Write a protein that binds this ligand. Structure first.
Ligand SMILES: Cc1cn([C@H]2C[C@H](OP(=O)(O)O)[C@@H](COP(=O)(O)O)O2)c(=O)[nH]c1=O
Ligand SMILES: [Ca+2]
Length: 129
């Protein structure tokens, strides 16, 4: 897997973000993550977390996995990094996302996110409180 550049166009919610990728606007959906929706519990807090992460970042990178790069809605499927820090994994660490939607061609950082989820749970953070 390799990182590729991109630039924030706009925060959207906890687990989607609009980026410019190879010169083209594109809604990206975070592999391996499920944040609550805005109108659900911890939804505002998940949206806020992702937003600040991406808005403060000096460098946004996109990392595709081995399989499906676009979902059926035309959303890009990737790991996103904010100044070298994985947004997908960081949500899970803080108990603001669950590990979810783990399909076989696209699960490279599964064990890593599972490890973070276990530790969010131990601390009973946010969603696990
Ligand atoms: C994260 C992810 C979601 N999806 C699809 C499955 C879900 O389909 P359905 O919409 O048919 O339920 C939807 C969940 O996205 P949201 O959690 O953004 O709603 O996006 C993928 O196909 N691959 C993925 O890797
Ligand atoms: Ca969601």
């Amino acid at each position: 897997l390799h990182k590729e550049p991109a630039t924030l166009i706009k925060a959207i919610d906890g687990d989607t973000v609009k980026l410019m990728y190879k010169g083209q606007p594109m809604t990206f959906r975070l592999l391996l993550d499920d944040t609550p929706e805005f109108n659900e519990k911890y939804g505002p807090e998940a949206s806020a977390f992702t937003k600040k992460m991406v808005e403060n970042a000096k460098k946004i990178e996109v990392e595709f996995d081995k399989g499906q790069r676009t979902d059926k809605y035309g959303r890009g499927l990737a790991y996103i990094y904010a100044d070298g820090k994985m947004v997908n994994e960081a949500l899970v660490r803080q108990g603001l996302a669950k590990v979810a939607y783990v399909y076989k061609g696209n699960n490279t950082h599964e064990q890593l996110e599972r490890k973070a989820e276990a530790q969010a749970k131990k601390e009973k953070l946010n969603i696990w409180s």
